[PDB]
Design a protein around this ligand. Structure first.
Ligand SMILES: CCN(CC)C(=O)[C@@H]1C=C2c3cccc4[nH]cc(c34)C[C@H]2N(C)C1
Lengths: 230, 338, 57, 281, 127
């Protein structure tokens, strides 16, 4: 050996220990999320939370969540979406009132679900703009049946849980959108990931709690599958 | 009107195709049919560099053929010494979404870029002995995919802004901007003389750019799917390209068209990295089906497999002296093969 | 004046690509073969090197 | 017939050694197999390996011959080491069950709660506590305090060197090495089963709009079938005025050894990741 | 070299029937999930229909459900969109676009503004 060789070995050991310590420090109880959606969707206002990629750090119960809103990029997303195949979930945001772009929301979610690298990643679907959707349905100026002919043959699910002071038409419409997304998620779903739907308004503050609970379910199911219990 | 211009462009493409077909005398596959093959090539993992806690997205060998720069999504840019498996450096990256990294030909600088649209250049040889960022090269609209060093002061970056750029490291501005790609430029490789460089994009076309002129010298269109990796031949008169359609394709600059297609029925998984050997006889391609296939660049027949990576292989580089082939996959391990 | 600008830029680039001295594909293949044959001995991967000269024991 | 029983016991100890050695070398060789749970499984396999290389090969000689050939102080050491390593194995089973319980019922704070420090604490307690209780109850005669008088008849009637539990040591050992570790392994492998059943029900019902049983049954049944007969007979041995035959006791202690035989095949070979690691080896 | 030139279209009276045809060159037509997209005047591109590589799967936009029929010819390397019983809103530029990668069930950038793999666009007008 030599003095230079010993110094190199000591430097390597110090670097390795520093890297290991920093990794276990910054990776414990810290989950990363991909906040994805459209401009009309309220993805910038999903979580109440009291230059090429945005960032949002929030915690619920001693668990830190990071959301990466990739906004300063070109509309083509088939390439930089492969960098997010390690997140615990994808915060998909959809504007339920805009039926015009609802179909592109549907097929964007379909592409996210069926992506080769995002197959394991489970989507936490957030159907935002519920106030707008309810106002549209109640007013009746906009018709959902023209933009989705299969709505006529649709009846609200038996196990639906609507708010007591809500209109059956609005409940039927919002659950129709939810079923559309869930059918897309369950048709080709391999069972390694699940879609967790939710109904979000612009004033809801428990979105952090909803994300926490669904990520808890995601990690619990991942652990059960890992241990051969599911 | 625009129909006259469209028709003129169509005639130009037609006559370019006719000229290419006329120049197409005989295929390289026919030329190499006489020579004996390379034979089975077995490469064993001499060294297994561990220390990355997450997926390794890119690497680049040094000119000295000893020090390689590795990048991961954890947020660390670890510089290794393949001879002794010694982490000579470990830079805390500001952005963890780095897609590319490079090592300077002089060995004094290291660059990295990703979804932050910024090429961060790190000064290895500092007076204080600590690594500090030398410049925040901003000016790209999309994510950087592959950046290469011309000198200690000139760097070329391929971004998903459908534009390659030439920067001045001292001034940090756009010395020369290359435009013309319809799709996101995913990788570029520099010619041995550094006068030219080709780039692969998400429009299934690879183009040759003149660094001094700043204009696209010629365009190569033979891919049926997105191009991900590109590397010059040791001549500098040819290059190879990878693509999602699992087909490697070798183009010749002077011939202005492809030569052979390195494809097989079994391979269906896309290509993530392409690199030639020192002599160019071996075309090593890193597929995303968890291993790599060494291709006989002359016979166009597979002549080896580099298996041993658990996850998708993302980067693959060959030393300048051609004494090693360090692969880096998504299983957080960077393996040197020889 | 955007579509016409793109079209004229495209036709100018096509002209600049067309007015080149395209060599024969047989000649290019011969050059590549000659280089591969000439430097076939400086390739440690193609021709395995003894472990004594192999830095990566 | 004795020779045939011996071949069978040789097969048992060989299976113990092979399985546990494979588990320990795999865990210590693959750096991907370096999770805290994997370290706990490695410690379990080390416990079982020592058991099978220290107390099984001589319990085999005792059994089928009913004559301890190796002395008296070595017999005391043998009994002490048997109780320590078996209690250590059962403690390791309980701690792996607790690790699974935390990983399932607290999936977010798992790498935080069950860190390498807590895993090392668990390994240390499952090694030190069993050891100290065992070589104690044996080398300070805490088990003979209840009835050395019965022991006098017992030692003579034993006409050899089998363990003795007067009235309380059998109950204490039963409630220290089996019941308390067993109740914890049943109060977490049943709570988990309820959650793993609910997940398998919601997933199945959502698709329309069982594997947990099998896995928890094998995990909580191998342990039970291998240990509970021996422990219930041993705790009832102070009562019934010691009516158990010695050969039945040998069969029961060998079932206890079969628990350590089957521990690797239940905790490592059963899961796909460790099988993939073995294939890579 | 990858030109998805499409034919057909033009001007038809409302309620008529136009049959768009697409010519695919330079790639294995049986490997890519083909799509049809329209661009209304002064509007973004709107995905119309989608047919799988084998043709077993199929899907349509709700606005054209039952009025458009999509068909592919793997041997002929041609993709068709049977537009019958048209409506005034059908006036748009139709592009024959394929999904970027073969053997994939996802299609990310088909509706992008400057997608690489699409035709120039056959104008369809109804009045
Ligand atoms: C035939 C006589 N021998 C051998 C000397 C025994 O009974 C051993 C004594 C044991 C024993 C006592 C008290 C508490 C315990 N926990 C775990 C065991 C245990 C193991 C158990 N082994 C298996 C048999």
């Amino acid at each position: 050996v030599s003095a230079e060789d010993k110094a190199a070995a000591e430097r390597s050991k110090m670097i390795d220990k520093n890297l290991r310590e920093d990794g276990e420090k910054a990776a414990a109880a810290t989950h990363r999320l991909l906040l994805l959606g459209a401009d009309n969707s309220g993805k910038s206002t999903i979580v109440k939370q009291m230059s090429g990629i945005f960032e949002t750090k929030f915690q619920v119960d001693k668990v830190n969540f990071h959301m990466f809103d990739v906004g300063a990029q070109r509309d083509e997303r088939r390439k930089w979406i492969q960098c997010f195949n390690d997140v615990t979930a994808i915060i998909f945001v959809v504007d339920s009132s805009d039926y015009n772009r609802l179909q592109e929301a549907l097929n964007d979610f379909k592409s996210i679900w069926n992506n080769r690298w995002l197959r394991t990643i489970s989507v936490i679907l957030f159907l935002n703009k519920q106030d707008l959707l309810a106002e549209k349905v109640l007013a009746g100026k906009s018709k959902i049946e023209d933009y989705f002919p299969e709505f006529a043959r649709y009846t609200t699910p038996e196990d639906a849980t609507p708010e007591p002071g809500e209109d059956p038409r609005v409940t039927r419409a919002k659950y129709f959108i939810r079923d559309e997304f869930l059918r897309i998620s369950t048709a080709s779903g391999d069972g390694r990931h699940y879609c967790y739907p939710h109904f979000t308004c612009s004033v809801d503050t428990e979105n952090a709690r909803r994300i926490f609970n669904d990520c808890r379910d995601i990690i619990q199911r991942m652990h059960l599958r890992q241990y051969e219990l599911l | 009107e625009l129909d006259q211009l469209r028709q003129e462009a169509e005639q130009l493409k037609n006559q370019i195709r006719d000229a290419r077909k006329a120049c197409a005398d005989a295929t390289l596959s026919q030329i190499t049919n006489n020579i004996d093959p390379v034979g089975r090539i077995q490469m064993r993992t001499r060294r297994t560099l561990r220390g990355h806690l997450a997926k390794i997205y890119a690497m680049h060998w040094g000119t000295d053929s000893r020090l390689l720069v590795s990048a991961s999504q954890d947020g660390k840019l670890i510089i290794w010494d393949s001879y002794t498996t010694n982490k000579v450096h470990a830079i805390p990256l500001r952005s963890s979404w780095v897609m590319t990294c490079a090592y300077a030909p002089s060995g004094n600088y290291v660059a990295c870029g990703g979804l932050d649209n910024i090429c961060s250049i790190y000064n290895l040889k500092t007076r204080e002995g600590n690594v500090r960022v030398s410049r925040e090269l901003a000016g790209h609209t999309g994510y950087l995919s592959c950046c290469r060093f011309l000198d200690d002061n000139q760097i070329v970056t391929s971004s998903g802004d459908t534009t390659c750029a030439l920067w001045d490291i001292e001034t940090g501005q756009q010395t020369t901007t290359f435009t013309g790609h319809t799709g996101d430029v995913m990788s570029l490789s520099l010619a041995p003389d550094t006068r030219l460089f080709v780039s692969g994009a998400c429009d299934a076309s690879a183009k040759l750019w003149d660094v001094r002129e700043g204009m696209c010298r010629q365009t190569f269109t033979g891919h049926e799917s997105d191009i991900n990796a590109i590397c010059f031949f040791p001549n500098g008169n040819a290059f190879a390209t990878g693509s999602d359609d699992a087909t490697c394709r070798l183009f010749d600059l002077r011939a202005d068209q492809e030569l052979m297609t390195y494809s097989h029925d079994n391979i269906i998984c896309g290509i993530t990295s392409v690199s030639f050997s020192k002599s160019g006889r071996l075309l090593l391609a890193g597929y995303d089906d968890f291993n790599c296939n060494v291709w006989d660049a002359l016979k166009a027949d597979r002549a080896g497999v580099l298996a041993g990576h658990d996850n998708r292989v993302s980067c693959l580089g060959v030393t300048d002296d051609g004494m090693a082939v360090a692969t880096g996959s998504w299983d957080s391990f960077l393996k040197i093969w020889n | 004046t955007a579509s016409i600008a793109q079209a004229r830029k495209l036709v100018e680039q096509l002209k600049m690509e067309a007015n080149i001295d395209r060599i024969k594909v047989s000649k290019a293949a011969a050059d590549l073969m000659a280089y591969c044959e000439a430097h076939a001995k400086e390739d440690p991967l193609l021709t395995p090197v003894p472990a004594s000269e192999n830095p990566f024991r | 017939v004795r020779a045939s029983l011996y071949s069978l016991m040789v097969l048992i100890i060989l299976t113990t050694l092979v399985g546990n050695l494979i588990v320990i070398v795999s865990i210590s060789h693959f750096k991907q197999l370096h999770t805290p749970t994997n370290w706990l499984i490695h410690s379990m396999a080390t416990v079982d390996f020592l058991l099978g290389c220290l107390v099984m090969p001589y319990s085999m000689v005792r059994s089928a011959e009913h004559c301890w050939y190796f002395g008296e102080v070595f017999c005391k050491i043998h009994t002490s080491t048997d109780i320590m390593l078996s209690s250590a194995s059962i403690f390791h089973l309980s701690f792996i069950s607790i690790d699974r319980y935390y990983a399932v019922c607290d999936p977010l704070r798992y790498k935080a709660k069950m860190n390498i420090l807590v895993i090392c604490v668990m390994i240390f307690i499952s090694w030190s506590v069993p050891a100290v209780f065992a070589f104690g109850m044996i080398f300070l005669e805490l088990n003979f305090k209840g009835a050395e008088e019965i022991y006098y008849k017992h030692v003579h009637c034993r006409g050899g060197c089998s363990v003795f539990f007067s009235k309380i040591s059998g109950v204490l050992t039963f409630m220290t090495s089996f019941y308390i570790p067993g109740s914890i392994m049943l109060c977490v492998y049943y709570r988990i089963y309820l959650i793993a059943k609910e997940q398998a029900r919601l997933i199945s019902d959502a698709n329309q709009k069982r594997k947990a049983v099998k896995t928890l049954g094998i995990v909580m049944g191998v342990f039970l079938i291998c240990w509970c007969p021996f422990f219930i007979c041993t705790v009832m041995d102070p009562f019934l005025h010691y009516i158990i035959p010695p050969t039945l006791n040998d069969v029961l202690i060998w079932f206890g050894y079969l628990n350590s035989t089957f521990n690797p095949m239940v905790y490592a070979f059963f899961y796909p990741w460790f099988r993939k690691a073995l294939k890579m080896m | 070299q990858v030109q998805l030139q499409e034919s057909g279209g033009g001007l038809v009276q409302p309620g008529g029937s136009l049959r768009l045809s697409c010519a695919a060159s330079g790639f294995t037509f049986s490997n890519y999930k083909m799509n049809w997209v329209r661009q209304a005047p002064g509007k973004g591109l709107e995905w119309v229909s989608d047919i799988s590589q084998s043709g077993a799967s199929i899907s349509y936009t709700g606005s054209v459900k039952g009025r458009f029929t999509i068909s592919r010819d793997n041997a002929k390397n041609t993709l068709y969109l049977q537009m019958n019983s048209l409506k005034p809103e059908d006036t748009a530029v139709y592009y024959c676009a394929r999904c970027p990668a073969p053997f994939t069930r996802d299609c990310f950038d088909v509706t992008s503004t400057t997608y690489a793999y699409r035709g120039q666009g056959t104008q369809v007008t109804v009045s």
